[PDB]
């Protein structure tokens, strides 16, 4: 999938068909994600897009646990470039599938959500401010809060 | 706007490449093999 | 908001069947690589306009 | 005779682009290890700064040499320019030839040996 | 001035005056150093004058003394320079002969003219007659 | 010891090299248009007033730049003013990026005026202007040709 | 966006039309950068004349909806041939065809 | 003046690639996963979060300052352009650039013309 | 003016790729096309000569 | 190739004296049709107890070679074996009595498999072994999908001879850029065909320059048959 010119939705369908068929495929496959983002600096500007939309498509059509995002580390100190525009086109491209509201909720509403460092970094007023700034730049701003008291 | 001259003139034409309706003259596979 | 389901009209597949019927007729007046190239031109002329509709 | 060498060096590059000569044998592998270029036909109103400004487009001249006369003169018309890289001299002899600055046209050639006070042809 | 002295070397060495060791000691080494270049094979009035002087230089000095100095130039990446060397070889060997060339030189010239025949671009026939 | 040598080099600009690039038919013109110089997209006209009443009308929507001077030989807009230099002040339109109150960003046509460093200087709003900077012209502002008061108003 | 960036800045589009791989977009961006822009921009009114050319010269066109010098090559099938080779092996015909009495051909890549 | 500096740079890169590095480099290599995290990778909203504006420091090969940012014409050999190089030439770069682009076009059409009746 | 006539002539020339062609009509068609190639203005004013006064 | 069965490393002990260590060795068997490299380990423990260690390896090798012939199937055993310089025609003749139809020949095509000990994936495998593992590797990585075995051999022996005459510049030539990554299941880098033949041209220029530096011979003064004789390793 990573290498076909423009992305073909056919892969997040075969992929999903496995990824919920046998128990194993979902586990192995997710391993491929966590493995995947934490490098993602090799392939860039194309394969990065095809693979990003590849995962967004799985999440949107589910057949993949909503917590794969525990690996995504939102920092702006520790995020690096191609990582950053991996996750960009990732959400921005997941945006319209779920629409903003149905994403905004399902991102948060799930209660048990605090597995990640993506959004919830309510930590020091740095990577907190950096989240807000990022998601405003990526042009979603569908979640922005005031932790500045 | 200052376009580069390397992008210019890379393909000529005013034909089609899908020449008329003559379906015998191998329109596919634009570049070579070896 | 909605979904769009697609199929091929019967006149298009009838036109392609009569198309390959006349390439079968023209098989007797040309060679083998010519009619295979003609099959290929007809198959691109179908498929590149019927991309998601062929499935 | 004073400016037909402009036409000669132009016809050399036209014959190179006509015959399809690759860059390995296109007249610049014979003049290697030398960043010195000779100028011809310069007007007498040119200072060293204007020559630097008109030939620093492809790289700054490291070593300038105008032919300033001893006592009674100011200039003759020749110049030596030593750039950084030899490809700058390639681009200067291929691009700055045939242009004109205030009347008289100028010419660019290579030196390749050493600077001389007067050996060339006025 | 290169063209003028290239014409001067032809007519100033043909009658009785200059001898062999005089020329092959101090006339021809700067001649092969500074004039056998790529820019002189481009202009046709300089292309013809070089070989037209080199013919009389081979008449005065000899065959293998010039050829063995330009026999390694048949494996160049330039077509017109190899064509100049090929015209030099054809005119010297058609005017003088081939008795002066020994066993230590003929495989070099044969391999050079075969390599020039393998990698020619234009439809000229000067290499054929050579 | 009196001089090092009587000759010496120059390293100064001759008129000729600057002149060949910028031609009024009999002389060089200072002021090459800045890269964002473009045609004015608003309706604009410069009206001269001798004393507050209409003299000609100059339509400014045609060109990116306009020159002020003493005669229609050199400058686009000339004045019968003996104490105006041949090149006096230049009217220049440009595209600049802008931000509105809402935070919306984009490209705006702005006209500017810059003194040429003319012999008698220039004034805007009946206030002296400094030379060598583009001043932002605003609607109805008065241009005048010499450091005190003059026989013509430009609006 | 990159055109307005190059207008706002003062750079040149050297190779920044390569992130879109020189052959993307439904008009196929390399149609703009060609030899005949100023002439083929005056060929307006197309895609309908070719459909009326079924009422002309007898070769029936299966490409009435496109021709490459205005909307571009909308498909690049190049790797299907290579994957056909890798699916049938690189020796897909050499074991079958007598290459050996063709000549002494040891390479089979310079074959023409 | 700078070709010998380029030779010194390529020889010190030659020495660091020979005397310490193996024959083949892998994916990890302890250098390439650093360069991949140090790529430009356009499409990054975090660029304006850490950078104020594209200013002009002393960005030059030497200590001396560099020419400002208008657009100079390309010349096939990426130069050290400085001290007022304003686009004066005879038109030899653009002509042979059009020549090589036309050559790359006519080889594409010549392959088509050769592959017609095969 | 020439920029449309060359488009029309190449639009006519595209329909002639095979050379197992007919005896007189389309060979003099391509002959008139190449005569319009060698002289654009002659065919350009010949179109105007057909275009003012000829309607039968 | 059985030259590197015995090889001695260079070391310095706690004392100032210099001695030799009979460390482990290699046996190279190469198939030029497919690219299979049969690499046999010779452990250090057989280098103790036996006498004339510099003369008994020629008799210890052929038994393991015959065991390899007996282990492999019928269609994969060779009809001809081209050995290195002659010391093994009669040992292979007396050890191949169970397979009489195998021809043993010593030709003029010597090949630098000792330069195969200069690459790192072979080097850490030959230095760290506690068993005669008999590994089976591949040198024609992904070339058979695009080129033949002929161009593969004509590339491989040139790169190996360039690594033999000068490991330094033949090592830096094989990585021409900083984007010349190598997958773990292969040993050669992955790069396009134009820079394949570019690396071939500059490595044959390396070999000709090493010849002209060693024997003080003008490179352009050699005929291309003589350039062929240098580039294959003919005894000149």
Q: What is the DSSP string of chain G?
A: -HHHHHHHS---BSSTTTTTTTS-TTTTGGGTSSTTHHHHTT--S-SSHHHHGGGSSSS--S-TT--HHHH-------HHHHHHHHHH-TTTTTTTTT-TTT---S--SS--
J181 CB within 8 Å of a chain H CB: yes
Q: Which of G82, G85, G106 to mutate to test the interface with J (most CBs of J within 10 A)?
A: G106
Backbone phi and psi for residue I32, each to the nearest 5 degrees, phi listed first = -70, -30
> Is H42 within 8 Å of chain A by CB?
yes
Task: Give the gap in angstroms from C-alpha A2 to the nearest C-alpha of chain G.
Answer: 15
Structure tokens at H76: 């096939």
Enumerate residues 51 to 110 of chain H having a beta carbon within 8 A of any beta carbon in chain B.
71, 74, 93-94, 97-98, 101-102, 104-106, 108-109
What does the alpha-carbon distance between residue J46 and residue J60 come to, in Å, rounded to a whole number? 10
Which positions in chain B touch I15 (Cβ < 8 Å)? 20-21
Q: Which two tokens stand for residue I2?
A: 């020439």
Rounded Cα distance between J234 and J216, Å, is 18
CA distance H96 to chain B (A): 10
Q: For the residues of J130-175, what is the DSSP string, one character each? A: SS---EEEES--S-TTTS-HHHHHHHHHHHHHHHHH-HHHHHHHS-
Determine contact, residues D25/E76, Cβ cutoff 8 Å.
yes
Cβ(E75)–Cβ(J220) below 8 Å: yes
CB distance from H9 to chain G under 8 Å? no
The answer to whether residue H36 neighbours chain A at the CB level (below 8 Å) is yes
Q: Name F105's bridge partners.
A: F99
Substitution target in J121, J125, J171, J191 with the highest count of H β-carbons within 10 Å is: J171
Identify which of J183, D71, G64, D113 has the alpha carbon closest to the alpha carbon of residue H27. Answer: J183
Q: Which residues contact A60 (CB under 8 A, 6 or more apart)?
A: A94, A97, A98
Phi/psi region, residue H90 (left: phi>0; alpha: psi -120 to 50; beta: rest), is alpha
Q: Distance between CA atoms of F18 and H10, rounded to whole angstroms?
A: 42
Please indicate whether, in this complex, the C-beta atoms of A41 and H33 are within 8 angstroms of each other: yes
Residue numbers in J near G85 (CB within 8 A): 145
**F/D Cβ contact: 3+ pairs below 8 Å:** yes
- Closest Cα to residue G27, out of G73, G75, G71, G74? G71
Buried b (16+ CB within 10 A) or exposed e, D72-95: eeebebbbbbbbbbbbbbbbbbbb
Q: Where are the beta strands (DSSP E) in H1-46?
A: none
Chain D touches chain I, with at least 3 Cβ pairs below 8 Å, answer no
- Give contacts of C13 with chain G, Cβ < 8 Å: none
> What is the experimental method?
cryo-EM
**Chains E and H: 3 or more CB pairs within 8 Å of each other:** no
Nearest Cα residue to I17 out of F19, E8, H115 = H115
Per the listing, tokens 């024959």 go with H23
**Which run of H or of E encompasses I18?**
none
Collect all residues of chain J within an 8 Å Cβ-Cβ radius of residue E69: none
Using the Cβ of I7 and the Cβ atoms of chain B, whether some distance falls under 8 Å is answered with yes
F4 → chain D, closest CA residue = D71
Structure tokens at I52: 């003012």
> By the CB < 8 Å criterion, does J221 face chain E?
yes
Sign of CA dihedral H62, H65, H67, H69: positive
Q: Provide CB contacts within 8 A for H82, sequence distance 6+.
A: D56, D60, H60, H65, H66, H67
B30–chain H nearest CA distance, Å: 7
For chain H, the chains sharing at least 3 beta-carbon pairs closer than 8 angstroms are A, B, D, G, J
Q: How far is the C-alpha of E27 from the C-alpha of I45, rounded, in Å?
A: 69
Contact check, Cβ <8 Å, G39/B14: yes
The two beta strands, F65-69 and F77-78, are: parallel
Q: Which residues of B touch G46 (CB under 8 A)?
A: none
CA of F5: which chain D residue's CA is closest?
Answer: D71
Contacts G58 to B, Cβ<8 Å:
21
Contact (Cβ atoms closer than 8 angstroms) between residue F142 and residue F154 = yes
Query: Any residues with CB less than 8 A from the CB of D111 and at least 6 apart, and which?
Result: D34, D36, D37, D38, D80
**Which of G3, G8, G12, G38 would best serve as a mutation to test chain B binding (most B beta carbons within 10 A)?**
G12
Chain F neighbors of D74, CB-CB under 8 A: 7
- Which residue from D14, D16, D15, D36 is spatially nearest to D24, judged by alpha carbons? D16
Tell me whether C44 touches chain G (CB under 8 Å). yes
Whether chain B has a CB inside 8 Å of the CB on H112: the answer is: yes
What residues of chain I lie within 8 A of the CB of G59, using their CB? 15
Q: D66: closest CA among F9, H84, H85, F14?
A: F9
Q: Chains G, I: CB contacts under 8 A, how many? A: 14
| CA pseudo-torsion sign G60, G63, G66, G67 | negative
Measured at the CA of F21, the angle between CA F132 and CA D4, to 5 degrees, comes to 150
J26 with J4: CB under 8 angstroms? yes
J57 closest CA partner among J80, J40, J77: J40
In chain J, what residues touch H26 (CB-CB under 8 Å)? 181-182, 184
- Chain H's closest residue to B19, CA to CA, is H116
Q: Do chains G and A touch (3 or more CB pairs under 8 A)?
A: yes
Check B15 against I16: CB less than 8 A apart: no
C22 interface with B at CB cutoff 8 Å: no
H/E element holding F143?
strand F143-144
Distance CA F99, CA C54 (A): 51
Point out the residue among G10, G14, G19 whose CB comes nearest to the CB of H70.
Answer: G10
Distance, CA of H86 to CA of A78 (rounded, Å) = 43
Give chain H positions within 8 Å (CB) of J185. none
Closest CA to E91 of E115, E73, E66: E66
Residues of chain H with C-beta less than 8 angstroms from the C-beta of J203: none
Q: In this structure, what DSSP letter does residue D121 have?
A: -
Measure the CA–CA gap between F111 and F39, rounded to whole angstroms. Answer: 10
d(CA B9, CA G36): 8
Cβ–Cβ below 8 Å for G59 and I6? no
Those residues whose C-beta lies under 8 Å from the C-beta of residue E26, and which sit 6 or more positions away, are none
Q: Which pair of tokens denotes residue H91? A: 């038109």
What does chain J come to in residues?
A: 236
CA distances from D82 to D34, D110, J199 (A): 8, 10, 34
**H15 CB near a chain G CB, below 8 Å?**
no
> How many CB pairs below 8 Å do chains A and H form together?
61
Q: What residues in G contact H69, CB-CB < 8 Å?
A: 9-11
Select the CATH number that applies to the domain covering D2-122 from these four: 3.30.420.10, 2.60.40.10, 3.40.50.300, 3.30.70.330. 3.30.70.330
Lookup: tokens for D40: 């011809």
H102 CA to centre of own chain: 23
Distance from CA of H17 to the nearest CA of D (A): 25
The residue count of chain E comes to 130
- Say yes or no for a CB contact (<8 Å) between E72 and J223: no
Sheet containing F153-154: order of strands: F48-49, F153-154, F143-144, F123-124, F127-128
Chain C contacts of B28, Cβ < 8 Å? Answer: 40, 44
Q: Which chains contact F through at least 3 pairs of Cβ atoms less than 8 Å apart?
A: D
């Amino acid at each position: 999938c990573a290498q076909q010119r423009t992305y073909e939705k056919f892969f997040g369908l075969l992929a999903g068909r496995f990824c919920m068929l046998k128990k194993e495929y979902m586990e192995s496959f997710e391993g491929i994600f966590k493995e995947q983002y934490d490098t993602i600096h090799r392939l860039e500007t194309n394969k990065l897009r095809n693979v990003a939309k590849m995962f967004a498509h799985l999440l949107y059509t589910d057949s993949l646990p909503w917590s794969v995002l525990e690996c995504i580390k939102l920092s702006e100190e520790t995020t690096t470039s191609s990582s950053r525009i991996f996750v960009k086109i990732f959400f921005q491209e997941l945006c319209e599938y779920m629409g903003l509201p149905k994403l905004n909720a399902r991102l948060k509403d799930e209660t048990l959500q605090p597995f990640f460092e993506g959004l919830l970094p309510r930590d020091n007023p740095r990577n907190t401010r950096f989240a807000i700034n990022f998601f405003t730049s990526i042009g979603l701003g569908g979640l922005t809060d005031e932790l500045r008291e | 706007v200052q376009y580069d001259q390397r992008l210019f003139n890379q393909s000529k034409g005013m034909d089609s490449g899908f020449a008329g309706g003559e379906d015998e003259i191998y329109n596919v596979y634009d570049q070579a093999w070896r | 908001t909605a979904q769009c389901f697609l199929r091929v009209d019967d006149e298009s597949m009838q036109r392609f069947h009569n198309r390959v019927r006349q390439i079968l007729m023209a098989s007797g007046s040309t060679t083998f690589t010519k009619i295979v190239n003609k099959w290929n031109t007809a198959l691109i002329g179908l498929m590149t306009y019927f991309r998601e509709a062929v499935v | 005779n004073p400016l037909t060498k402009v036409k000669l060096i132009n016809e050399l590059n036209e014959r190179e682009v006509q015959l399809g000569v690759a860059d390995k044998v296109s007249w610049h592998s014979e003049y290697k290890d030398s960043a010195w270029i000779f100028l011809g036909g310069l007007p007498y109103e040119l200072t060293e700064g204007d020559i630097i400004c008109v030939f620093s487009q492809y790289g700054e001249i490291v070593n300038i040499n105008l032919v300033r006369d001893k006592k009674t003169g100011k200039s003759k018309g020749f110049c030596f320019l030593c750039y950084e890289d030899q490809r700058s001299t390639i681009l200067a002899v291929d691009n700055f030839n045939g242009i004109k600055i205030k009347g008289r046209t100028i010419r660019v050639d290579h030196v390749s040996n050493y600077r001389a006070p007067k050996d060339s042809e006025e | 001035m290169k063209k003028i002295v290239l014409k001067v070397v032809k007519q100033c060495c043909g009658t009785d005056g200059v001898e062999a060791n005089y020329i092959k000691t101090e006339i021809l080494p700067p001649f092969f150093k500074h004039f056998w270049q790529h820019r002189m094979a481009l202009d046709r009035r300089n292309y013809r004058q070089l070989v037209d002087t080199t013919v009389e230089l081979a008449n005065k000095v000899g065959a293998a003394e010039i050829i063995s100095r330009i026999v390694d130039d048949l494996k160049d990446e330039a077509e017109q320079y190899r064509k100049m060397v090929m015209e030099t070889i054809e005119k010297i060997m058609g005017n003088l002969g081939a008795a002066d060339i020994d066993h230590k030189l003929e495989e070099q010239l044969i391999d050079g003219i075969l390599y020039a025949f393998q990698e020619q671009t234009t439809e000229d026939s000067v290499m054929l007659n050579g | 010891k009196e001089v090092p040598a009587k000759e010496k080099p120059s390293f100064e600009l001759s008129g000729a090299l600057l002149e060949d690039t910028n031609t009024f038919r009999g002389v060089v013109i200072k002021y090459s248009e800045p890269p964002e110089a473009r045609i004015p997209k608003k309706r604009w006209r410069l009206y001269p007033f001798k004393n507050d009443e209409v003299l000609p009308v100059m339509y400014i929507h045609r060109q990116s730049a306009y020159l002020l001077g003493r005669h229609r030989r050199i400058a686009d807009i000339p004045i019968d003013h003996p104490s105006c230099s041949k090149q006096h002040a230049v009217f220049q339109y440009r595209l600049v990026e802008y931000t509105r109150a809402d935070g919306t960003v984009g490209r705006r046509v702005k006209p500017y005026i810059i003194d040429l460093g003319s012999g008698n200087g220039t004034f805007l709003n009946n206030k002296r202007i400094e030379p060598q900077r583009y001043y932002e012209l605003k609607e109805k502002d008065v241009l005048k040709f010499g450091f005190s008061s003059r026989e013509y108003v430009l609006l | 966006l990159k055109r307005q960036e190059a207008i706002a800045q003062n750079r040149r589009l050297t190779l920044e039309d390569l992130e879109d791989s020189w052959d993307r977009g439904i008009p196929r961006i390399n149609t703009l950068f060609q030899k005949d822009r100023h002439t083929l921009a005056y060929d307006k009114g197309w895609r309908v004349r070719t459909d009326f050319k079924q009422y002309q010269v007898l070769k029936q066109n299966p490409f009435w909806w496109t021709h490459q010098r205005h909307d571009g090559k909308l498909w690049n099938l190049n790797n299907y041939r290579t994957d056909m080779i890798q699916a049938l092996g690189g020796v897909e015909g050499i074991l079958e065809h007598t290459l050996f009495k063709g000549t002494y051909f040891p390479t089979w890549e310079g074959l023409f | 003046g700078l070709a010998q500096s380029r030779q010194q740079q390529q020889n010190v890169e030659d020495a660091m690639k020979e005397m310490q590095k193996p024959l083949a480099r892998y994916i990890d290599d302890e250098d390439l996963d650093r360069m991949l995290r140090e790529q430009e990778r356009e499409g990054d909203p975090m660029a304006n979060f850490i950078k104020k504006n594209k200013a002009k420091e002393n960005k030059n090969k030497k200590v001396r300052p560099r020419y400002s940012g208008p657009a100079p014409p390309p010349n096939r050999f990426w130069p050290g352009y400085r001290w007022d190089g304003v686009d004066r030439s005879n038109g030899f770069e653009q002509k042979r650039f059009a020549r090589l682009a036309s050559k790359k076009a006519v080889e594409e059409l010549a392959y088509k013309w050769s592959v017609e009746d095969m | 003016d020439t920029k449309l006539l060359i488009l029309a002539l190449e639009r006519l020339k595209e329909a002639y790729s095979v050379k197992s062609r007919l005896n007189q009509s389309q060979r003099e068609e391509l002959g008139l096309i190449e005569q319009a190639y060698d002289n654009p203005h002659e065919a350009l004013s010949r179109i105007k000569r057909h275009l003012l006064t000829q309607r039968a | 190739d059985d030259t590197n069965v015995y090889r001695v490393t260079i070391h310095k002990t706690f004392e100032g004296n210099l001695t030799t260590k009979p460390i482990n060795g290699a046996i190279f068997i190469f198939n030029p049709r497919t690219g299979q490299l049969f690499l046999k380990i010779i452990h250090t423990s057989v280098w103790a107890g036996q006498k004339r260690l510099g003369q008994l390896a020629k008799w210890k090798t052929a038994e393991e070679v015959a065991a390899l012939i007996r282990s492999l199937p019928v269609e994969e055993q060779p009809k001809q074996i081209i050995v290195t310089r002659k010391g093994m025609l009669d040992p292979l003749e007396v050890h191949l009595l169970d397979f009489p139809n195998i021809v043993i020949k010593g030709s003029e095509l010597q090949l630098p498999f000792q330069a195969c000990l200069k690459v790192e994936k072979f080097g850490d495998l030959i230095l760290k072994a506690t068993e005669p593992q008999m590994v089976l590797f591949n040198l024609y990585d992904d070339w058979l999908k695009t080129i033949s075995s002929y161009t593969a051999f004509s590339r491989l022996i040139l790169i190996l001879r360039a690594l033999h005459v000068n490991n330094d510049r033949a090592k830096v030539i094989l990585k021409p850029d900083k984007t010349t990554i190598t997958e773990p299941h292969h040993i050669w880098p992955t790069l396009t065909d134009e820079e394949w033949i570019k690396v071939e041209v500059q490595l044959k220029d390396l070999i000709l320059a090493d010849y002209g530096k060693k024997n003080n011979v003008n490179v352009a003064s050699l005929t291309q048959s003589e350039i062929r004789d240098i580039i294959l390793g003919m005894e000149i």
